[PDB]
Write a protein that holds these residues in place. Structure first.
Motif, PDB file in Angstrom:
ATOM      1  N   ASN A   1       0.835  -1.194   0.000  1.00  0.00           N
ATOM      2  CA  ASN A   1       0.000   0.000   0.000  1.00  0.00           C
ATOM      3  C   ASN A   1       0.871   1.246   0.000  1.00  0.00           C
ATOM      4  N   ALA A   2       0.743   2.058  -1.051  1.00  0.00           N
ATOM      5  CA  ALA A   2       1.618   3.215  -1.205  1.00  0.00           C
ATOM      6  C   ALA A   2       1.365   4.269  -0.138  1.00  0.00           C
ATOM      7  N   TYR A   3       0.114   4.428   0.291  1.00  0.00           N
ATOM      8  CA  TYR A   3      -0.213   5.449   1.279  1.00  0.00           C
ATOM      9  C   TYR A   3       0.243   5.051   2.676  1.00  0.00           C
ATOM     10  N   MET A   4       0.072   3.785   3.046  1.00  0.00           N
ATOM     11  CA  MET A   4       0.555   3.341   4.347  1.00  0.00           C
ATOM     12  C   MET A   4       2.071   3.406   4.422  1.00  0.00           C
ATOM     13  N   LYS A   5       2.753   3.169   3.301  1.00  0.00           N
ATOM     14  CA  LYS A   5       4.202   3.336   3.264  1.00  0.00           C
ATOM     15  C   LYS A   5       4.590   4.793   3.469  1.00  0.00           C
ATOM     16  N   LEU A   6       3.806   5.717   2.913  1.00  0.00           N
ATOM     17  CA  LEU A   6       4.075   7.137   3.100  1.00  0.00           C
ATOM     18  C   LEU A   6       3.893   7.551   4.553  1.00  0.00           C
TER      19      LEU A   6
ATOM     20  N   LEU B   1       4.315   5.166  15.177  1.00  0.00           N
ATOM     21  CA  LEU B   1       5.153   4.456  14.219  1.00  0.00           C
ATOM     22  C   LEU B   1       5.178   2.961  14.507  1.00  0.00           C
ATOM     23  N   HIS B   2       5.216   2.580  15.784  1.00  0.00           N
ATOM     24  CA  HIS B   2       5.228   1.161  16.121  1.00  0.00           C
ATOM     25  C   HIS B   2       3.902   0.495  15.784  1.00  0.00           C
ATOM     26  N   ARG B   3       2.788   1.188  16.015  1.00  0.00           N
ATOM     27  CA  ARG B   3       1.481   0.595  15.767  1.00  0.00           C
ATOM     28  C   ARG B   3       1.129   0.560  14.287  1.00  0.00           C
ATOM     29  N   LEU B   4       1.668   1.481  13.489  1.00  0.00           N
ATOM     30  CA  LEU B   4       1.398   1.456  12.058  1.00  0.00           C
ATOM     31  C   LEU B   4       1.979   0.224  11.384  1.00  0.00           C
ATOM     32  N   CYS B   5       2.962  -0.422  12.004  1.00  0.00           N
ATOM     33  CA  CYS B   5       3.642  -1.566  11.419  1.00  0.00           C
ATOM     34  C   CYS B   5       3.100  -2.903  11.904  1.00  0.00           C
TER      35      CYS B   5
ATOM     36  N   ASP C   1      -2.465  12.105   8.434  1.00  0.00           N
ATOM     37  CA  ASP C   1      -1.621  13.204   7.986  1.00  0.00           C
ATOM     38  C   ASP C   1      -2.099  14.532   8.554  1.00  0.00           C
ATOM     39  N   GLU C   2      -3.418  14.702   8.683  1.00  0.00           N
ATOM     40  CA  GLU C   2      -3.955  15.925   9.264  1.00  0.00           C
ATOM     41  C   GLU C   2      -3.612  16.022  10.742  1.00  0.00           C
TER      42      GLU C   2
END
Lengths: 210, 96, 173, 129, 165, 167
Positions: free
Chosen positions: F21-26, F47-51, F120-121
RNA sequence: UGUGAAUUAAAAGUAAAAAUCCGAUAAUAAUGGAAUGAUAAAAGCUAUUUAAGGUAAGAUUAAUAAAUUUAAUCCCGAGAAUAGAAACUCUUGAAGAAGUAAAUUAUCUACCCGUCUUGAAACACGGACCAAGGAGUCUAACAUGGAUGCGAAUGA
RNA sequence: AUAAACAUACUUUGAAUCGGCCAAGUCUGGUAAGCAGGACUGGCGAUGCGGGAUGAACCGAACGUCGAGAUAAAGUGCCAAA
RNA sequence: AAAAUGAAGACAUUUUAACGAGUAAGGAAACGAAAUGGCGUAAGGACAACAAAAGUAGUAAAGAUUUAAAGUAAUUUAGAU
């Protein structure tokens, strides 16, 4: 900017004078007592050594499970590795248990200096970095009031208050090879062998090994 | 690297330069004295070898080469008595 | 072989701390000298290292290592059969010099290694007190013998040639 | 400027027993035999590929001339390595004709790009010409 | 090769102490056990009812529950490669107060006595006393001087062998 | 050689967004930069939970957002997961930042007067995290967890995968 | 009458020369190399200033002394401030340098592969040689797990 | 006291395996066995290297590709470095 | 493993430190700081001279035999016939 470097430089000088005063003054007091005991016909019993340097002599193959655990708690995990050990009833018994695998003794000040200056290193952020400056020592052991390599040497040699914290930062030294024994390392040093307590004769072995 | 690690090295090196230089002068002047002491001994030997010629020999053929004071000379005798006692006190200790 | 003077005292309930054990121990180095010294205390007075303080461990040097003396070493050793006491005489100039002879001689004639021999004592005997049949022949003042079949001596390994030239001769010397 | 290219082992890792049987080719295959002499690293026969033989990363895949390889099939392929003529070298593919090879060689001289097949598929101008 | 009986191999384990047969003390049934105490399981073969299993003999446990006639005890047992929690109910005839914390309870009282005086000293403004030093292994003995007037010397040498027959 | 306790193996922590997913990578790049530079524990937590994987990123419903935010009126819930709608109970007014909002959940928050931000917001408004309330969903409510173990056990039996003749 | 282990008197001797033995040690240094590198300025080194310091021991003299005892004045002097400097030679190579490959020789080194087995180079089995074919696949049910969509719904 | 953050606690899914053999300052049956069976540990199996001439287990020591140096077991008349 | 940097360089980024034997067995694909990295056979869908003639080919394809080069290797590349 870097006007603190001169301030750092002078402070290391001041501590060095203090450190050398303590070692010289304590050494002088022993001589005076020995001199006066002879005059009065008394008997003088020298104080027992406080610092012990142990070297791992035998390899990692064929070790009993209890001996294996002790050598890990002393950080002698490799052949030809030297560590410093506080002397008490607890550690002396442990060294006797692992006697066939180690040789140890009581180091002189010059032995401690050369070991730290040549083979010294610290564990910083899990990285075994060799000692290259006093700024790397100030960062590592700032809260333990050790800021210079000379302060590191003095705390080890005199076995000060923060020996455990200072000693645990020093990585075990890695020494070269040297003639271990007269007969072989399968007998005690008392029998002419290689392992066991060498008392003050460990300095001669360390001289060829550093 | 030694200076960077140990800024005190420059001070200690200077004293070691002094001590090595000073102890070289002291050795030179003692060898000069012992050269003369041996010089007196050699002449005291050739003179008193005349026991070959012909026989008791003289008692004071060795001549002093250092002029010292009377207070020191008394101290020299006192120190000699100390070492005889120390050598005797030590020997009896191992005599058992 | 070096001779040491070792003292210690025992500080516990059983032993009063006012009686000092002395010894004269012949050992290759001072660590072995203490090891021998502690065993004699433990095997004779129940004194252990953990309950004792060492006081002095000093080397003993020969007073006159230029005078020939006849020694008499009283010792006990262990064989296959049992335990025996021997008295062997030696001629040397140092007390340590004669002891190394005894250790090397025992290990050859009796095949007895060093860890079977206890040196009880060593004294100096007279010239007529020597009883060794071989050693008694050299104690007189008029000893004299020609050393025959001498091998020619080389000054150093420098001139030690593998193959020489000419013929080889011994020396009536 | 050109660095020193060091090869840790210049020989060939030949398959075990390939020198005795013609059915066993010389392309390497790790021996999985339970009693195999080579896989147990016996003295005399203990030569197997390892990651330790890998050459230096800086001087890897570099031709002896000091440049890398960049195959070309037409003139427009050369335009991709004209900014890096100090780094790459044209290598005309094996199927490219002789008529097209002249155009590549002529253009690559213009763009100052070395060609490693400069004398490939040349005409019979070797005798009597 | 033994049999799998409940009380196998207890000819010596379950024997009474020499000249220690008959009834037990009266302190055994009068001792008061509270939750959290340390006790020792000691099977009393004189009382065969409710005898604890022979694997728990000599183990030290903790009181976790007090019932009208039985005292709950919680010990640790070792299994293939883990440790499990064993909860038993034992009459006071088979347990015994443990002295495992006897030395620790002495240091707790010594510190508490010192801390009680400090609140008095701080109240009155006097400097406060320090807590007792921590236990250390037997340390190297310091330099000592022995007077030369009350000293006797005993010579030590290897002893001449003498036959014991 | 050296006598170690164990040999170095790969640490079992993910350090990037799983998948392509390009957006989750961003987002991982955006918060990897924020955690490294600002050195804030909040950006390290996001950052830890996004992964984490999808199974380890459980959903949170509007009912749980409503209750957890009851005593936090001027606050922004931050849940790194999908936000579903609990149709049984009303949705109050609240600003929620989440990876995804269900069609029915977003309309319930919007109508009540709230705001459905993305990640992002939130980094634009509260990068280090100042009016945030970290929220994560329950993990033990999965139906898989019932069947783990031995169903013959005396203490906590499993739940017996059904099959042939499961009475 | 002679030698003489040991001891004793006097002279000399401030008790550091040199040689050998015995103990003690091994490291600072100097001069030659070897392996892998680097080449440019220095928290280089040197010169001039003031002066923390020289804990037996930098020197000398004094009081005295089995002293790493106490003084005095001379020396040197770390920090710091000010001025200082490194840019090279010779040999070989498109008459083939350095490297690489093949063949032969010489020293060292090397038992038949696969397989069952506690253990095979085995007097245990299959294998004369080469080419081509040659063996975890598909369908259906369940579970876990990684990516995906939607979400009290999902699929249709 | 000592050591320990790539520590510690794990959770889920699953592979292969349960013919074993050896040594010993150990034991039981047996006259004994390179026999049969056990307690504790270390090995071989799954393991090459230097030494014991040769050897699954012995001694030193466990292996990425290499250069130089001290070493280990053990050796220093020749084979064979000393 | 940890620090630093990061829309694209390039060698799967830079630095430091530790580590590297192995039968049965495991490590599916993808995952920018990548939750192992790759070589080969055939077939299907796209891409392959960006200015309107757009991968190679009778100025010689595939195959075969050899000579050299790249890669630790699986293999790849080019010359000659």
């Amino acid at each position: 900017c870097k006007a603190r470097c001169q301030a750092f430089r002078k402070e290391v000088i001041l501590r060095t004078i203090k450190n050398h005063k303590d070692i010289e003054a304590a050494k002088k007091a022993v001589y005076t007592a020995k001199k006066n005991a002879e005059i009065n016909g008394d008997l003088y019993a020298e104080a027992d050594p406080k610092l012990i340097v142990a070297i791992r002599i035998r390899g990692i193959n064929g070790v009993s499970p209890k001996i294996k655990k002790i050598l890990k708690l002393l950080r002698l995990r490799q052949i030809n590795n030297a560590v410093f050990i506080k002397a008490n009833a607890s550690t002396i018994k442990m060294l006797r248990l692992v006697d066939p695998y180690v040789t140890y003794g009581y180091p002189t000040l010059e032995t401690v200096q050369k070991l730290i200056y040549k083979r010294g290193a610290l564990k910083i952020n899990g990285n075994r970095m060799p000692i290259t400056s006093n700024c790397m020592i100030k960062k590592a052991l700032g809260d333990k009031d050790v800021v210079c390599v000379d302060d590191l040497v003095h705390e080890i040699y005199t076995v000060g208050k923060h020996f455990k914290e200072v000693n645990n930062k020093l990585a075990p030294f890695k020494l070269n090879g040297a003639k271990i024994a007269e007969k072989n390392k399968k007998i005690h040093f008392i029998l002419g062998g290689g392992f066991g307590n060498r008392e003050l004769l460990i300095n001669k072995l360390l001289a060829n090994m550093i | 690297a030694m200076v960077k690690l140990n800024p005190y090295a420059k001070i200690a090196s200077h004293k070691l330069a002094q001590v090595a230089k000073a102890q070289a002068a002291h050795k030179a002047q003692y060898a000069a004295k012992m050269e003369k002491i041996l010089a007196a001994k050699k002449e005291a030997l050739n003179q008193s070898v005349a026991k070959r010629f012909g026989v008791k020999v003289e008692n004071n053929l060795l001549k002093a080469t250092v002029k010292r004071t009377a207070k020191q000379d008394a101290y020299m005798k006192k120190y000699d008595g100390i070492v005889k006692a120390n050598a005797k006190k030590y020997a009896e200790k191992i005599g058992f | 072989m070096k001779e040491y003077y070792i003292t210690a005292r025992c500080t516990d309930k059983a032993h009063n701390p006012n009686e000092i054990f002395r010894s004269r121990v012949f050992a290759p180095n001072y660590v072995v000298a203490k090891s021998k010294f502690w065993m004699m205390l433990k095997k004779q007075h129940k004194v252990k290292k953990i309950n004792a303080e060492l006081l002095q461990c000093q080397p003993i040097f020969e007073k006159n290592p230029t005078v020939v003396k006849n020694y008499q070493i009283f010792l006990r050793y262990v064989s296959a059969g049992g335990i025996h006491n021997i008295t062997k005489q030696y001629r040397d100039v140092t007390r340590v010099g004669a002891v190394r002879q005894m250790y090397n001689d025992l290990a050859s004639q009796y095949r007895t290694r060093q860890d079977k021999i206890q040196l009880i004592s060593i004294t100096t005997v007279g010239d007529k007190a020597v009883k060794n049949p071989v050693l008694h022949q050299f104690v007189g003042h008029h000893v004299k013998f020609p050393m025959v079949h001498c091998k020619p001596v080389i000054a150093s390994k420098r001139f030690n040639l593998p193959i020489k030239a000419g013929k080889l001769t011994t020396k009536l010397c | 400027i050109k660095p020193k290219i060091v090869k840790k082992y210049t020989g060939h890792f030949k398959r075990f027993d390939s020198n005795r049987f013609l059915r066993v080719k010389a392309s390497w295959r790790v021996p999985r035999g339970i009693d195999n002499r080579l896989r147990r690293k016996f003295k005399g026969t203990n030569l197997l590929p390892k990651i330790g033989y890998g050459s230096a990363k800086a001087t890897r895949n570099m031709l002896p001339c000091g440049l890398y390889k960049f195959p070309v099939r037409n003139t427009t392929d050369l335009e991709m390595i004209m900014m890096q003529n100090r780094k790459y070298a044209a290598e005309i593919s094996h199927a490219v004709s002789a008529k097209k090879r002249q155009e590549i060689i002529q253009r690559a001289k213009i763009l100052n790009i070395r060609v490693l097949n400069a004398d490939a598929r040349i005409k019979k101008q070797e005798v009597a010409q | 090769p033994l049999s799998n009986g409940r009380n196998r191999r207890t000819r010596k384990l379950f024997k009474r102490p020499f000249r220690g047969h008959g009834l037990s003390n009266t302190s055994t049934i009068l001792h008061t056990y509270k939750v959290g105490d340390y006790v020792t399981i000691l099977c009393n073969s004189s009382i065969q009812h409710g005898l604890p299993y022979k694997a728990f003999h000599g183990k030290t446990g903790r009181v976790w529950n007090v019932n009208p006639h039985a005292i709950g005890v919680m010990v640790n047992k070792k299994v293939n490669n883990r440790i499990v929690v064993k909860r038993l109910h034992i009459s006071p005839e088979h347990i015994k107060p443990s002295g495992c914390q006897k030395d620790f309870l002495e240091r707790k009282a010594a510190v508490a006595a010192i801390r009680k005086q400090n609140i008095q000293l701080k109240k009155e403004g006097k400097p406060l006393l320090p807590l007792p030093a921590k236990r250390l292994p037997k340390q190297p003995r310091p330099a000592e001087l022995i007077k030369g007037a009350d000293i006797k010397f005993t010579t030590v040498a290897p002893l001449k062998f003498e036959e014991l027959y | 050689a050296i006598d170690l306790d164990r040999h170095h193996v790969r640490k079992h922590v993910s350090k990037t967004a799983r998948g392509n997913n390009a957006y989750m990578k961003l987002l991982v790049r955006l918060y990897g930069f924020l955690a490294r530079r600002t050195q804030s524990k909040f950006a390290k937590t996001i950052l830890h939970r996004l992964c984490l994987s999808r199974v380890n990123r459980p959903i949170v419903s509007t009912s749980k957002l409503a209750c957890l935010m009851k005593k936090h009126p001027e606050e922004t819930a931050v849940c790194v997961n999908t936000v579903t709608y609990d149709s049984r109970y009303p949705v109050p007014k609240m600003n929620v930042c989440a990876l995804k909002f269900t069609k029915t959940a977003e309309a319930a928050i919007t109508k009540a007067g709230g705001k459905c931000l993305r990640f992002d917001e939130l980094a634009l408004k509260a990068p280090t995290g100042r009016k945030t309330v970290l929220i994560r969903g329950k993990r033990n409510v999965r139906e898989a967890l019932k069947h783990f173990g031995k169903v013959c056990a005396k203490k906590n039996p499993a739940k017996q995968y059904k099959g042939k003749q499961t009475k």
